[PDB]
Amino acid sequence: ARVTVQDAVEKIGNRFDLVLVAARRARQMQVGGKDPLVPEENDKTTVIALREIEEGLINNQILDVRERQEQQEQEAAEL
Amino acid sequence: VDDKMHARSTGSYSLVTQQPLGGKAQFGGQRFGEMEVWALEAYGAAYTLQEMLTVKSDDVNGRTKMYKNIVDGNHQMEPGMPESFNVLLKEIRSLGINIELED
Amino acid sequence: EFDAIKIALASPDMIRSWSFGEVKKPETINYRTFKPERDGLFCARIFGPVKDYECLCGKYKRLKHRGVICEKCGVEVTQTKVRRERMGHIELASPTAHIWFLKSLPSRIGLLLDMPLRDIERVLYFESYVVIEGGMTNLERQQILTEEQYLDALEEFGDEFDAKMGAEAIQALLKSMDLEQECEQLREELNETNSETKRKKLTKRIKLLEAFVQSGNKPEWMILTVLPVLPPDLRPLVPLDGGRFATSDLNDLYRRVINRNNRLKRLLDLAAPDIIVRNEKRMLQEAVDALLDNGRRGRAITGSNKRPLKSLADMIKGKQGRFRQNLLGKRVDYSGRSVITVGPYLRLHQCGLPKKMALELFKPFIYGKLELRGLATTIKAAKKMVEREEAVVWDILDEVIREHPVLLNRAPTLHRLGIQAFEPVLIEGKAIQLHPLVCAAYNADFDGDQMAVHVPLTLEAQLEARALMMSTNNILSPANGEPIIVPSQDVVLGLYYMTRDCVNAKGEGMVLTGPKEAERLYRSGLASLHARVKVRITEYEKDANGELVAKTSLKDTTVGRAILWMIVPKGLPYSIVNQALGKKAISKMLNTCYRILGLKPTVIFADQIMYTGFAYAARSGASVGIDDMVIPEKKHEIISEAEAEVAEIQEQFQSGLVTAGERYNKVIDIWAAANDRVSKAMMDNLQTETVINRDGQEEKQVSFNSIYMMADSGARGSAAQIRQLAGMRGLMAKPDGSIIETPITANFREGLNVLQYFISTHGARKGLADTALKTANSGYLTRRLVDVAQDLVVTEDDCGTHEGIMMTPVIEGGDVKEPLRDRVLGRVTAEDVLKPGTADILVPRNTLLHEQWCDLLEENSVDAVKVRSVVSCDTDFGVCAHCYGRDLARGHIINKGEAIGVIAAQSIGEPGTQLTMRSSIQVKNKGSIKLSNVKSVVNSSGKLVITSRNTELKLIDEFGRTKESYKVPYGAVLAKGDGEQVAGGETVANWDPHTMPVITEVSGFVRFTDMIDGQTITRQTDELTGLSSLVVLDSAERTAGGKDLRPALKIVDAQGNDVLIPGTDMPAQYFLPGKAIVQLEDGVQISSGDTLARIPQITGGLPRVADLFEARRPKEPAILAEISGIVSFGKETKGKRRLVITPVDGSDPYEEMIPKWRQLNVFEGERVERGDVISDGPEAPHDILRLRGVHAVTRYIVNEVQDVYRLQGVKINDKHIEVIVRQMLRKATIVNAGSSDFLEGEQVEYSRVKIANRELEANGKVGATYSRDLLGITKASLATESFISAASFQETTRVLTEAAVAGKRDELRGLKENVIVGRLIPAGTGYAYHQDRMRRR
RNA sequence: GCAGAGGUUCUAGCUACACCCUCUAUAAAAAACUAAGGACCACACGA
DNA sequence: CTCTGAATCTCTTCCTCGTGTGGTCAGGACG
DNA sequence: CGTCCGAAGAGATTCAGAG
Ligand SMILES: NCc1c[nH]c2nc(N)[nH]c(=O)c12
Ligand SMILES: [Mg+2]
Secondary structure, three states, rough: OOOHHHHHHHHOOOOHHHHHHHHHHHHHHHHHOOOOOOOOOOHHHHHHHHHHHHOOOOOHHHHHHHHHHHHHHHHHHHO | OOOOOOEEOOOOEEEEEEEEOOOOOOOOOOEEOOOHHHHHHHOOOOHHHHHHHHHOOOOOHHHHHHHHHHHHOOOOOOOOHHHHHHHHHHHHHOOOOEEEEEE | OOOOEEEOOOHHHHHHHHEEEEOOOOOOEEEEOOOOOOOOOOOOOOOOOOOOOOOOOOOOEOOOOOOEOOOOOOOOOOOOOHHOOOOOEEEEEEEEOOOHHHHOOHHHHHHHHOOOOOHHHHHHHOEEEEOOOOOOOOOOOOOOEEEEHHHHHHHOOOOOOOOOHHHHHHHHHHOOHHHHHHHHHHHHHHHHHOOHHHHHHHHHHHHHHHHHHHOOOOHHEEEEEEEEEEOOOOOOOOOOOOOOOOOOOHHHHHHHHHHHHHHHHHHOOOOOHHHHHHHHHHHHHHHHHHHOOOOOOOOOOOOOOOOOOOOOOHHOOOOOOOOOHHHHHOOOOOOOEEEEOOOOOOOEEEEEEEEHHHHHOOOHHHHHHHHHHOOOOOOOHHHHHHHHHHHHHHHHHHHOOOOOOOOEEEEEOHHHHHHEEEEEEOOEEEEEOOHHHHHHOOOOOOOOEEEEEOOOOOOOHHHHHHHEEEEOOOOEEEOOOOOOOOOHHHHHHHHHHOOOOOOOOOOOOOOEEEEEHHHHHHHHHOOOOOOEEEEEEEEEEEEOOOOOOOEEEEEEEEEHHHHHHHHOOOOOOOOOOOOOEEEEEEEHHHHHHHHHHOOHHHHHHHHHHHHHHHHHHHHHHOOOOOOOOOOOHHHHHHHHHHHHHHHHHHHHHHHHHOOOHHHHHHHHHHHHHHHHHHHHHHHHHHHHEEEEEOOEEEOOOOOOOOHHHHHHHHOOHHHHHHHHHHHOOOOOOOOOOOOOOOOOOOOOOOOOHHHHHHHHHHHHHHHHHHHHHHHHHHHHHHHHHHHHOOOOOOEEEEOOOOEEEEEEEEEEEOOEEEEEHHOOOOOOOOOOOOOOOEEEEEEEOOOOOHHHHHHHHHHHHHHHHHEEEOOOOOOOEEEEEHHHOOOOOOOOOOOOOOOHHHHHHHHHHHHHHHOOOOOEEOOOOEEEEEEEEOOEEOOOOOOOEEOOOOOEEEEOOOOOOOOOEEOOOEEEOOOOOOOOOEOOEEEEEEEEOOEEOOOOOOOOEEEEEEOOOOOOOOOEOOOOOOOOOOOOOOOOOHHHHHHHHOOEEEEEOOOEEEOOOOOOOOOOOEEEOOOOOOOOOOOOOOOOOOOOEEOOOOOOOOOHHHHHHHHHOOOOOOOOOOOOOEEEOOOOOOOOOEEEEOOOOOOEEEEEEEEOOOOOOOOOOOOOOOOOOOOOOOHHHHEEEHHHHHHHHHHHHHHHHHHHHHHHOOOHHHHHHHHHHHHHHOOOEEEEEOOOOOOOOOOOEEHHHHHHHHHHHHHHOOOOOEEEEOHHHHHHHOOOHHHHHHHHHHHHHHHHHHHHOOOOOOOOOOOOOHHHHOOOOOOOOOHHHHHHHHHHH
């Protein structure tokens, strides 16, 4: 569990931006069927998203690339 | 502590559609007043402030929706427009001042 | 959805469009039927069905009938929300004026008609006739005519004379009025008019008329032909008070208005007598007046339990008013209150939450988790399971409580720290537990304090809470870069007991392997906590950036300090723990930990500190006892000596040697001295009293007395409280403010006498009442500061503005009140900071000053640093991120989008509770004395006497810094030369403040030019001098003939040839004011620089801060010279002392109507610069801004506010005041229109005029000239462009009327009206959304 | 309510945002679906 | 001699939340 | 059975005596 977000603010400088990027990843993790890249240590989706930012697995640019890749995958599914 | 302890998840609302009636006797929620609003305002809190203002206080659709979303397991907030603001609009319009939300 | 909110005056056709029906009948409903009346105030046909999807007849029900109006009911079936959605209107038989436009501060309808208001309410309330369209008659169309005069005019003139009464008469007048013709007429009149008061009135009228011209509004629309009626859900009148189902409210006012309208209609139909018709029209007009605004009429409709009936405007405005009542603050779901409990076992990030409270707060989350688990097949089953409270429900609660942060809010949220999120932990007790360290941050106690607990719901909300709201994030207070989680009461005492030294204790002199061995010895009890031992300490040094270098050394420290060293992380040095570790010490320790290590190590360190402190305080067994209190043995002797002295003074008073006032002063002085001696003796017998045998001779050591431990450690209670406890309480002032002659000589340990207790209770009750009004005024000031500074967010990373305020340590001469290190910390430099050594750039042009940079400046002793300020940045509707500097709470440059304005408003407002509502130049240490702006001429003795009154004596030490700075007045004797080292403790200047000597330019004899003894200013014997003196008489003092001649002291040779003042052809003549003592007679020589004549000679609390922020004009503002020039008297104080100031290059002389009584600080013939003080008094901030730059007034107001705060011991960074200043001067008056669209006689936002100036500069057009205008926080908030934001602050009526008349359109974009709208605010996490929305345009 | 009609239940339950099922003239076989009227004023107390 | 600054006369606010107690109109016949 | 019957601070408002 992340009780301190200081490492995540190092990864995203704005800190307020860190809430927004984490929210998009967390929404993808909960409402969408998206696997948590970070291992889940009995953690809620919001904490997993913060952990992913601290890991560097997820960043605002990385989330955008993954969303674009999903859009391309949808076109492949359309065939 | 028995008298002073109080809480509500959902409960009866007033005519102004402020969902918490207020007070312990009625099943009412604590007033998130101007000082509290400025406190969250000084913080970077915007999403929490928006949620508390709209979906937790006065939204005929949002309060019903949010409940369905939470019981569905997803925490998505529909902003909508506070009912108290529509009350203000209709009251000022009744006073004789044309107040309207132009696009 | 919508992009902008538009407000404008509504037309009658527009009202008809909103309405779905006309309310003909007054009674709202038939109570027995509980059914809306067909034409009643509540009508199903007019507004909507009372029961959703049910017709009044009931023929049409639910679906398949939805949307279809059954003829018999007459009501369309629709959702019941349509009741509040659909509005109605009431036809008015007589058009009736809108009171808001009728009665206001500038009287909109009166201003349009150029008519006095009194005439307006006379004609509206049918007291006289306005003669509209006089025509061939002598009377003009706008005049007002008396009733009997109206009849006389009827006799004189018939069809041509058409005087009329009532609101419809005023409506006809406005219809006859033409906007554009009167606009050009007003412009021509303004061009012709040369009276600035008449010009001001004409400008007001032309602004109003132009507002009507541009906006789609008609003057006749002000009179309401049709009056809209509120929807019925909004005024339900459904209280169901035990079947009564009735209450007195706005519905009664609507009933009264409808009744009056029906009576007037039937009277008109019946052709009632004209007097009765006009009386009925008066009644209807008064009813509508009270309905729109009760109390504007001056008579309040009453009958609701004999209390004033609330009007629609009253619901609209004030704390009772909905915008303050609900829109600004909305009650929230998922919220609860309970009393507070300590529970130290909790970590800092987490808190204690009652099991039962959590089940109610997280009930929807519990229902969802149960459904996902499948334990509850349906949501109704889940509801039943929660009521059952089975073990499964409690396990589900644990899962939801695990990572959903809960906001904890103190009842008065003065600062952002008041609401901090925490990770909830289930507890058996029914009381919320708050982690002890953060209790100080909340300013809350455990005296039954109650915290509201709210549960954020969304993933955005939870992430926002964990990222920012959580207590671990807010280590440092936003106001000052200091830890706000500083340990407060018990842990500090425990550490102080731990981190203490004893001369002799068991285990002393031992050698210990490490802190672990120290802990093991202490638990074994072989060595006490506070015995000194020689133990090695392995301290890691962060000298290598990011690398820890281990150093192990033997250090002579106490066992307790060794034990605490385990708690400290590796990075911190061991020197910090080696001290006593009181409260300031532990605060510095936490600050150093945050600065050197990361925030997470700091959080762990703070939690470990709290745990260790509590444990070792409990093990310590600190206890307060009567024997613990020490009463000095010298106290009774000192009191007896003081009483003997008092008796001696009483004998002197009886002998008549000393007056009553002097005797009272002497008694106060001797009692104060006795109190000080008692306090000193008590300290001597308390702080070091213990004498302990030390392996040999007994050795005095710092005393371990528990009360002294509490006082010295700073845990709770200062030395003053202890002095009141064990020493004599001392002089207690009676409630007015005067000190009682007899103090309280009895300490709290001894029994207090009844009279002593009464005297004490005087001040106690005074303090309690003053604290209550402190809280009230602090709340008001905080609200005003928030409202004025709400619309401030960081919008640009770097403006690049080279301009900035000059930052220097403030020195009053006694000491350096504010070191430069604290003031410029976390502030980005305005320019490159060169070394005192020339051409050596120590600090670059734009660099944020962290601790390293501030220390580096200190080593090179850079006394003055010019730094960026929020006023300096050129961003419009925003502030430069670099200009604001450090966040002051997260220890780095402010992040983009954070709302600094609300932060600063809360930071300033919060200490207001603590704030109390109610010569010889001594040099401290050797240094170079420096004089600036000094005009001094050596006297006969050669000592320097200075004509300039703006000169200051700032001493510069060897490092180049200004150690001390002093001020010397007109004609101030200077003992020591300028620019040379002066020994510490000597008197640099020795002027007499009472006298005002005037120096002599040229050595010679005086001559009587207009100073002739015979006319006036005759010689008056001076007993003290022993020589008669030709004192100059003041204008009232002298005769009329003396007033005409202005004295001028000519200096001549022995023969009589006039000796000219150096550098000027005119002879040296000194213009002597009244009461100036001219000791030397005619033909008496005066040496150069000698005195030719001698002229004999504020709130400190929250009201002072309120005055400073309001920029209120002082009672006797100090006059400042508009431009550099020569001074002279236009008048001999005739009516008003007239002063001419004309420059040599500037032909136009500034003219001032100086009051006669006010002393003239400037010499009458003196030549002064711009902004120089002319009359002694408090400087007016408006004048300061007009004369000096914005930077200078900023420094002035910041210095004054800080000095008020510095007195109370609370520290606030200057940027917090600076942003409030920037909001205060947001509005800027335009000096000249130039090529700009704005008229020169207008006031617009400085941001908008700046943008217009940039636009005009970009192309080939003349730039606009603007004068910065200081506005009070109340005025600045009221004058904001966002009319919703202004209406939120205060005075909703005037703001709404001004917006409606001008047709103002708020484009949202303000931090507050977004709160009212409820959408995303442009705060930190909403700034991205707002900028994306703006670019989507 | 596939449209019309009826509906187990777990108040009431084709709209409140609603939703689903079976059936062919009218009710009866079945599980999954969802939040309620509170106005004003005084007194007192607690922060 | 017609407007000075000055005296005067209304207008608006005067924390911020709890918790308990209470008391309450319009407007009665009337065909 | 509807149905009518203080305090304080500040901005207008005079107003006015004076250059
Ligand atoms: N609200 C619809 C309704 C009433 N009764 C019901 N019975 C069942 N089985 N299903 C339903 O959907 C309904
Ligand atoms: Mg308390």
